[PDB]
Amino acid sequence: SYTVGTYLAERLVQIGLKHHFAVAGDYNLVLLDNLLLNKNMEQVYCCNELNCGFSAEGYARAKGAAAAVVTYSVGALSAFDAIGGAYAENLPVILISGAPNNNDHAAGHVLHHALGKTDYHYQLEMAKNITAAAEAIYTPEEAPAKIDHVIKTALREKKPVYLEIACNIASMPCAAPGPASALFNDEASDEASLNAAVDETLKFIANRDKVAVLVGSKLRAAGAEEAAVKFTDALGGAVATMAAAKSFFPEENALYIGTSWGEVSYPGVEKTMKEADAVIALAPVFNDYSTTGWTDIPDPKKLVLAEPRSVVVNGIRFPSVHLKDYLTRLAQKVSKKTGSLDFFKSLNAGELKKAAPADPSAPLVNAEIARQVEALLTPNTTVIAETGDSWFNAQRMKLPNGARVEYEMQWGHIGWSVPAAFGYAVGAPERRNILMVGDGSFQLTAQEVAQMVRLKLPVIIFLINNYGYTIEVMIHDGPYNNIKNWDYAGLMEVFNGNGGYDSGAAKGLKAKTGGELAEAIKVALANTDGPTLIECFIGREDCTEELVKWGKRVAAANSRKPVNK
Amino acid sequence: SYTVGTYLAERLVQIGLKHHFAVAGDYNLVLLDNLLLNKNMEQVYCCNELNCGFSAEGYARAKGAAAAVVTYSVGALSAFDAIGGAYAENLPVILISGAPNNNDHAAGHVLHHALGKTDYHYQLEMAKNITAAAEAIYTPEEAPAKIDHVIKTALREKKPVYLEIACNIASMPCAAPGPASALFNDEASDEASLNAAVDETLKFIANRDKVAVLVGSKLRAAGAEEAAVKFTDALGGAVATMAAAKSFFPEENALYIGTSWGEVSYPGVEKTMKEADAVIALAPVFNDYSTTGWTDIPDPKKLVLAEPRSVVVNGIRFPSVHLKDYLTRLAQKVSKKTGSLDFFKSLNAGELKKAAPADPSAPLVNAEIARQVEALLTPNTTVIAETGDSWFNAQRMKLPNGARVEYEMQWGHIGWSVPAAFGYAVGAPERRNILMVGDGSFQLTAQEVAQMVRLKLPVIIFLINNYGYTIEVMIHDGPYNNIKNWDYAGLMEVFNGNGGYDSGAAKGLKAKTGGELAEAIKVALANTDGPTLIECFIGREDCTEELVKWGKRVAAANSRKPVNK
Amino acid sequence: SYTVGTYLAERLVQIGLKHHFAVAGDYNLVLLDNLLLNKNMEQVYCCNELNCGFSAEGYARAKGAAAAVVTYSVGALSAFDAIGGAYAENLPVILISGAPNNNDHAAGHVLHHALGKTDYHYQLEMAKNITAAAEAIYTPEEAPAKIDHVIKTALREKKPVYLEIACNIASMPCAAPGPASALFNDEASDEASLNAAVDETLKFIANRDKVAVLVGSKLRAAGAEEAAVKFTDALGGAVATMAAAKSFFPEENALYIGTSWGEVSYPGVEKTMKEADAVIALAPVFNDYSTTGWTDIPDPKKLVLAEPRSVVVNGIRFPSVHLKDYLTRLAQKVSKKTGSLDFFKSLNAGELKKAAPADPSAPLVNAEIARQVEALLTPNTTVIAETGDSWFNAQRMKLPNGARVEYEMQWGHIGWSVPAAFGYAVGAPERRNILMVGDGSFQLTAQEVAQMVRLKLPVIIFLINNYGYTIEVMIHDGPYNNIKNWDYAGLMEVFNGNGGYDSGAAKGLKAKTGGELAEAIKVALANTDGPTLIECFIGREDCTEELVKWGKRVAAANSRKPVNK
Ligand SMILES: C/C(NCc1cnc(C)nc1N)=C(/S)[C@H](O)COP(=O)(O)OP(=O)(O)O
Ligand SMILES: C/C(NCc1cnc(C)nc1N)=C(/S)[C@H](O)COP(=O)(O)OP(=O)(O)O
Ligand SMILES: C/C(NCc1cnc(C)nc1N)=C(/S)[C@H](O)COP(=O)(O)OP(=O)(O)O
Ligand SMILES: [Mg+2]
Ligand SMILES: [Mg+2]
Ligand SMILES: [Mg+2]
């Protein structure tokens, strides 16, 4: 019959996982054995649990959901940072922790890996703060219901969930899992509300000429990217993407006008948004960074707020209205309103100004790195863009339809990109997978490139070596922004370990000129058997113009004085 | 006048810190500026926050207390694993997190680095589970009391504490700190209880010939190492150390009989403890690992339980009795009882059997590594011993008076030893600092060796390359015990980065024979300007005899069946 | 436009409330003002907050949902006991607490009614433990989403929820509420799972002659009472009700065999359940009391477990299958299987033995009270039966189709019945409402009878004056089971207060014989303007036979010795 462990394994396969990620520990080893019995998915190992969590986060970006398996307390507490990250970025990551033998509860027993006390609910209680569901399993009869509950919750809420499983019950028998269709069972839109939300939107824009659409970073979580284009093509108004929504709308679409991000918007976009009579915001996240230090907030009286599962429009709130349905029906009924796009064109603001190819023997500069990476973009490419100036470099790139950008702009844990790129490339090996990561960020999680070597993943890594934390320098500078430099190129042979117990096919190259970068890229593209790290040398102050302006607003928001209470 | 930040700085200097550890982030930059104004301590930077926390843990082992400064949520959640570690290992580590501008509470504001919701008490609430005190500071007037409370609590309980400081109040004025003596103010022993606990101990052993003393791993937390020797010298009974208490009792002392650890005890110790009429346990921790899978538990009827701040003896419980006072006073009143040591000697069990020097050209084996490391021990040496077979290799070493061993046996987070060794070597640069760390553990936290390079710390690192997780292999084996191999020796030149933006004086060497190891040790001893990593190659199954036996009991305890409820 | 307060008011009207319950306090007065603006519901006041919560609980039993409004901390903490009760009994009760001015967060301000510290998230965090959803509202813009989320959650989960509203935002403007239909929007059954669950049930009983149906106490929460009858009529097998499910199945139905409650079952039922080949359990709650101290637990091999939203049958678990749908579809597909009923009839066990009418001048006994109350039952009657021997007296009564019994057997808070009867009679004034409550229970919450007087509710109260806690006497006796006696009959004129500031039409009567009881019942039935309390005098040991037997098993389960861990 099924066991607690194989029940969990079958449910993971049923929701579409082809892989799950893990770090062994004595509290989870039997559970890992059970998961390995299901040959419809592979078990992938990680260096540490923070990286294991972020690897699952990256895999969920590629495949829609993911799972990570860690040991009690010492494994789960660090993995919590990555699970909070999954919560912040709306990804269904299932964290499963091994846990104490079920005889040790209420027994006055002190156990290894715990705090030295005799009670073991602290980890579960901590996990409730950063998950949508969190269940401890102490007996085998309780497992099927707790597993089904947390997996249904993760999928319908697009949030991470927690499970712990007593180490001595992982191989115990339980009931068999029913059909997979039950796991995707979710509310439909309330018919009357859906129709009323659509109707009130038509009423709201009936006498408004300039209707602009602002694409937000929960659009994919709502499963509404295709429906958005149906609507925007019907409307014919100007469409802009918020920074974190890059690649959630087609940039070669005739109505696309570029990035909306306050004073670091593409030319003409800020003025177009300001002059709109109505802004239809599709699942946006308005926080201190996306509003450019609270300087760029949508006019409340011009706003139609279409979240994933509700619409606020014309002064009325509509719960139980799914964004995909709302956009699809609105697309069928809306009239053609081109005024916002006419207005944008009338500014004659031109396209984003980009640098021409550098003299190849001149010293490398940031703009030349960005040009050559941008030239690699195809319909089959994904760029993983780390927190740092890589945010702003990636934002400036024109995406061919189908090309994807992965951003972690809400959580913003530097170092996320390395393990996230590993997990993503495991989930989508058919793609050209590019990682843009700063030197400062790289040092927090660099060891996961060794797993890329191990699984022969041809990830192209652009390591931006500007000697320190340049985005922090452009917010508020001090001696804490300085780091110890590494030979980053040389680290690839360290992870290969050729002549040691195993081998690898990673390559590490240095680029100090445009010519050296172009040559390194050719070698990277030809290396199909392992990752290629290109160490790019540029000055600390050689950064985007956008970062300089945005960093000043962030610094001011963070330090603004207390108000009188 | 003082500010919130300089108040904190002065309090940390007053409890004896010469250094604090940090990883910058926009929510803590101003706070770091304020801490830097106090020139009586240095601010040391770390690669990531899990390592920052463990670096503080290691420094508290050297100096008594420590502090780590991180950014909100993305920095604190991973640092929580290390703080839970400090709780488990009884070290006063002060975690200070930057936090949101104080205007963002109750304002409907979504902020970067948080969950996407508008409330910010989740981190504090999570921190309460793993600390002795935990205070959020939202206004400057509240800072002095919360800082004084958590620092007093940490010192008196020997436990980690938590602070968060709103980022816009770090430079705001507050009252000045009073005398340092107030921070160390603690209860004295209750005089009637102290005398009664001593008297009932005399009554309990009055007709008990064989009295053995069992030294436990909370002895240093009780500040009772020197008082323990006063008592054991007066009693003259056999003295044994639990595994995690190695170096908390002088091994050249005439009454010392070696390690007590169930069936992996030193020769004759297990039998001596079993035959004792009374066991006086000094601040023990009895858990599933220290009891060898619950197979070695002290006889309740023969036990005198002298914890740090209470004694249970002769059927009576005495709270408010401090262990240093109890031992000092009992030393003055106890009679000479040599029966247990006479019994031990009567066994003729001999000393722990150790291997003779290997043929220097033969393939390196585990026992030869342990012999050469043991030969480097002086009165000025400290050995940092990682979770893994290094636990058992270090346990076997004879310590000259003054030599120290640092263990993390309660928390047991593999990878602790790298950052802990960095922090310890910052705190105690005058000592011969040796790190024994397995390959699997090293990969969790390896980047903190670059900080050793940066501060020119001459840490001697023995990297045990047995290609995988051998201790886990000896508990329960599977494909999850296999790892990707690295060129560990070559990583030292990567962290030097000579020819790059800066430089280093680290050296990495390989040892595949006893002769190569001896040579590498000479070079390590002569390298005063950076760390020396010696990559030692041995087989997976070439491990201590003790690990094989202990691992089987641990596996059986972990998997024992549920009992009928 | 709508305000935070009138938004909440309209949502409560939309889910069907005609009344909400409240206790004034300065943190909620403006909120109460706003709620009063909606004239589609009445605001009902209570004596204290524990009674206010239980009044809402009773009202949800009558109408399906309810709301209670209290002041911060001093009002909410006692109301939490009643909210936990609503969670335990599966009732959608919405607790709304007033809360501090939104300027007092992060301001170093100490406030009245709170703990003396300067932070105010403790109440919210406590509420999360006993609710399905819990949201604090600090700004008006955040109110609509949090209100809609908690109300939808309460209805779909059939569980209580929590809201707190800053006292200075209750009259602030917010968006208007959409259609009421959105609040009832819930998942449908997964169609493949529903058909498969039905088919696997047919497969399971295919070669099983005696199929018995066991009706559980979550049948009403699943909305499946009528579907159960469709299925049982089609099957034609014996049908029994668990104790807490009394009145959730029609007792005049030809297949009904009476109460299943282990050794205190109706005659022939225990043997019939034991001999069944299959037991189909409809939404059961198996706990220490319903299993008669764990002596009566269903055979796992014979069990079909049809919960509210899942079925476990034939070794397979089916999430996403709603009980009403499962029973309706199974009713259409099942064959006639009368074997369990034939078996029951073949026992010739006879009907439950009931006492003949007493000599009317003899001293009143418990069986004569129960006979005269049972004779008052009509199709329009509800009996509210308090924890105590009234549980067992009520269980013995034959219900005419349509008559209801209300039990609080999972929470079991003595004193629940008085405020619950008040709230139920406000929600269902057309019914003949009978309260059976013991003297001990009455003393916890007696003051809510004054509200019955105030609103002129003709509740007939049988006060069972056996001088103390008889059910506790029959579990384990001591001096703690003794209470101070009151003139309970005389309390009705106290709550009238005729000749004081107002008036009342309550009547209190004493009954010491069957004749006196019959006369008091006549007066009670004729009193249409207020409650009538009949103080019935019986001996401490004059209790049901069932209580004696059940109490012994409960005492033994509670005291069973710890098992070896
Ligand atoms: C230290 C920090 N942010 C604070 C931070 C610190 N800790 C964690 C885990 N997450 C964080 N965001 C940041 S953005 C650096 O400047 C990034 O440095 P790098 O990767 O080197 O990029 P650039 O040089 O382009 O800025
Ligand atoms: C994986 C794990 N323990 C589980 C574990 C996993 N995750 C964390 C953070 N802490 C833990 N203790 C352990 S003990 C390894 O076998 C250690 O490997 P290594 O350092 O390579 O040592 P040996 O080869 O001598 O055993
Ligand atoms: C004290 C207690 N139960 C414990 C209890 C105590 N506190 C609360 C709030 N809830 C509880 N169930 C119980 S059942 C009494 O015997 C009830 O007394 P009474 O109402 O007088 O009934 P009977 O005499 O028929 O038993
Ligand atoms: Mg950098
Ligand atoms: Mg190893
Ligand atoms: Mg009574």
Side-chain angles (χ1 to χ4, degrees), chain B residues 188-210:
Chain B
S189 290
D190 174 59
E191 189 66 36
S193 297
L194 168 56
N195 286 325
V198 169
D199 202 51
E200 294 290 330
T201 305
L202 297 182
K203 277 155 77 168
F204 188 73
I205 68 175
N207 297 141
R208 284 169 202 265
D209 176 51
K210 302 176 282 273

Short mmCIF file of all heavy atoms in Angstrom, two decimals, chain B residues 188-210:
data_model
loop_
_atom_site.label_atom_id
_atom_site.label_comp_id
_atom_site.label_asym_id
_atom_site.label_seq_id
_atom_site.Cartn_x
_atom_site.Cartn_y
_atom_site.Cartn_z
N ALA B 188 22.71 36.53 44.05
CA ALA B 188 23.72 35.66 44.69
C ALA B 188 23.03 34.34 45.05
O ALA B 188 21.79 34.22 44.96
CB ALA B 188 24.27 36.36 45.93
N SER B 189 23.79 33.33 45.44
CA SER B 189 23.21 32.10 45.98
C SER B 189 22.45 32.42 47.27
O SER B 189 22.89 33.27 48.06
CB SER B 189 24.27 31.05 46.31
OG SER B 189 24.86 30.49 45.14
N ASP B 190 21.29 31.78 47.46
CA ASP B 190 20.56 31.90 48.74
C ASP B 190 21.42 31.16 49.77
O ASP B 190 21.69 29.97 49.66
CB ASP B 190 19.16 31.27 48.64
CG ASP B 190 18.46 31.26 50.00
OD1 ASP B 190 18.27 32.37 50.57
OD2 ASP B 190 18.10 30.16 50.49
N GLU B 191 21.85 31.85 50.83
CA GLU B 191 22.80 31.33 51.80
C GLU B 191 22.30 30.09 52.54
O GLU B 191 23.03 29.08 52.54
CB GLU B 191 23.24 32.42 52.80
CG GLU B 191 24.38 32.02 53.72
CD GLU B 191 25.72 31.78 53.03
OE1 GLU B 191 26.11 32.46 52.05
OE2 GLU B 191 26.43 30.86 53.49
N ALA B 192 21.04 30.07 53.02
CA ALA B 192 20.50 28.85 53.63
C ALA B 192 20.41 27.69 52.63
O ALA B 192 20.70 26.56 53.01
CB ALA B 192 19.13 29.10 54.27
N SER B 193 20.04 27.94 51.36
CA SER B 193 19.94 26.83 50.39
C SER B 193 21.32 26.27 50.03
O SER B 193 21.54 25.07 49.88
CB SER B 193 19.22 27.33 49.13
OG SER B 193 17.89 27.71 49.50
N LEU B 194 22.28 27.19 49.86
CA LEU B 194 23.66 26.81 49.53
C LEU B 194 24.20 25.89 50.62
O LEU B 194 24.68 24.79 50.33
CB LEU B 194 24.53 28.07 49.38
CG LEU B 194 26.06 27.86 49.31
CD1 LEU B 194 26.43 26.90 48.19
CD2 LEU B 194 26.79 29.19 49.14
N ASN B 195 24.04 26.29 51.89
CA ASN B 195 24.54 25.46 52.99
C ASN B 195 23.79 24.14 53.08
O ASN B 195 24.41 23.10 53.31
CB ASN B 195 24.54 26.23 54.33
CG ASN B 195 25.65 27.28 54.38
OD1 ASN B 195 26.75 27.08 53.85
ND2 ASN B 195 25.41 28.44 54.99
N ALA B 196 22.46 24.15 52.90
CA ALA B 196 21.67 22.91 52.96
C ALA B 196 22.00 21.97 51.80
O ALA B 196 22.12 20.76 51.99
CB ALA B 196 20.16 23.21 52.98
N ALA B 197 22.19 22.52 50.58
CA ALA B 197 22.56 21.67 49.45
C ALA B 197 23.91 20.99 49.73
O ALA B 197 24.07 19.81 49.45
CB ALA B 197 22.66 22.48 48.16
N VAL B 198 24.87 21.76 50.27
CA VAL B 198 26.16 21.13 50.65
C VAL B 198 25.95 20.04 51.70
O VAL B 198 26.40 18.90 51.54
CB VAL B 198 27.17 22.19 51.16
CG1 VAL B 198 28.38 21.53 51.81
CG2 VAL B 198 27.62 23.09 50.00
N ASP B 199 25.26 20.36 52.80
CA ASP B 199 24.99 19.38 53.85
C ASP B 199 24.27 18.13 53.35
O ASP B 199 24.66 17.03 53.76
CB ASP B 199 24.20 20.01 55.00
CG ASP B 199 24.35 19.23 56.29
OD1 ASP B 199 25.51 18.96 56.69
OD2 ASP B 199 23.30 18.92 56.92
N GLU B 200 23.25 18.23 52.48
CA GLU B 200 22.54 17.04 51.99
C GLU B 200 23.42 16.21 51.05
O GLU B 200 23.20 15.00 50.93
CB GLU B 200 21.23 17.39 51.27
CG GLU B 200 20.17 18.01 52.16
CD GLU B 200 19.58 17.01 53.16
OE1 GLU B 200 19.52 15.81 52.84
OE2 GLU B 200 19.18 17.45 54.27
N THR B 201 24.37 16.85 50.36
CA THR B 201 25.33 16.09 49.56
C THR B 201 26.21 15.25 50.49
O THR B 201 26.45 14.08 50.23
CB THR B 201 26.20 17.04 48.71
OG1 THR B 201 25.33 17.87 47.92
CG2 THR B 201 27.16 16.28 47.82
N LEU B 202 26.72 15.86 51.57
CA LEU B 202 27.51 15.12 52.55
C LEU B 202 26.71 13.95 53.13
O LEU B 202 27.21 12.83 53.17
CB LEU B 202 27.99 16.06 53.68
CG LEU B 202 28.93 17.20 53.25
CD1 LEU B 202 29.36 18.02 54.48
CD2 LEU B 202 30.15 16.70 52.50
N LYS B 203 25.44 14.20 53.48
CA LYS B 203 24.55 13.15 53.97
C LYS B 203 24.38 12.04 52.93
O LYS B 203 24.42 10.86 53.29
CB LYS B 203 23.17 13.71 54.35
CG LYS B 203 23.08 14.31 55.74
CD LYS B 203 21.99 15.36 55.91
CE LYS B 203 20.61 14.71 56.04
NZ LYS B 203 19.54 15.66 56.49
N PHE B 204 24.20 12.40 51.65
CA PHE B 204 23.98 11.40 50.59
C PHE B 204 25.19 10.51 50.36
O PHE B 204 25.01 9.30 50.17
CB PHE B 204 23.62 12.10 49.28
CG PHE B 204 23.19 11.15 48.18
CD1 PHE B 204 21.94 10.51 48.23
CD2 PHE B 204 24.02 10.90 47.10
CE1 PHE B 204 21.55 9.64 47.23
CE2 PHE B 204 23.64 10.03 46.08
CZ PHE B 204 22.40 9.41 46.15
N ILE B 205 26.42 11.09 50.38
CA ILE B 205 27.61 10.28 50.15
C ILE B 205 28.23 9.75 51.44
O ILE B 205 29.25 9.02 51.37
CB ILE B 205 28.68 11.04 49.33
CG1 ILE B 205 29.28 12.21 50.14
CG2 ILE B 205 28.08 11.51 48.01
CD1 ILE B 205 30.42 12.93 49.43
N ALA B 206 27.61 9.98 52.59
CA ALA B 206 28.21 9.58 53.87
C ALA B 206 28.50 8.08 53.90
O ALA B 206 29.59 7.69 54.34
CB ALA B 206 27.31 9.96 55.04
N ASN B 207 27.56 7.25 53.44
CA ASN B 207 27.80 5.81 53.41
C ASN B 207 27.93 5.29 51.98
O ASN B 207 27.53 4.15 51.69
CB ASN B 207 26.69 5.05 54.15
CG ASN B 207 26.62 5.38 55.63
OD1 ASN B 207 25.52 5.49 56.18
ND2 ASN B 207 27.77 5.54 56.30
N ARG B 208 28.49 6.10 51.08
CA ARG B 208 28.67 5.70 49.69
C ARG B 208 30.16 5.79 49.33
O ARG B 208 30.71 6.90 49.26
CB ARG B 208 27.85 6.56 48.73
CG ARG B 208 26.36 6.18 48.75
CD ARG B 208 25.52 7.20 48.00
NE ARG B 208 24.14 7.08 48.48
CZ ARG B 208 23.19 6.34 47.90
NH1 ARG B 208 23.49 5.65 46.80
NH2 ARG B 208 21.98 6.30 48.45
N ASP B 209 30.80 4.66 49.10
CA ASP B 209 32.26 4.62 49.02
C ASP B 209 32.79 5.19 47.69
O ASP B 209 33.75 5.97 47.66
CB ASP B 209 32.75 3.18 49.17
CG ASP B 209 34.25 3.02 49.00
OD1 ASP B 209 34.99 3.79 49.66
OD2 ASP B 209 34.69 2.16 48.20
N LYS B 210 32.17 4.76 46.59
CA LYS B 210 32.63 5.17 45.26
C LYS B 210 31.79 6.32 44.71
O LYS B 210 30.63 6.17 44.30
CB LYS B 210 32.64 3.96 44.31
CG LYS B 210 33.53 2.84 44.83
CD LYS B 210 33.46 1.60 43.93
CE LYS B 210 32.16 0.84 44.23
NZ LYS B 210 32.39 -0.10 45.35
#
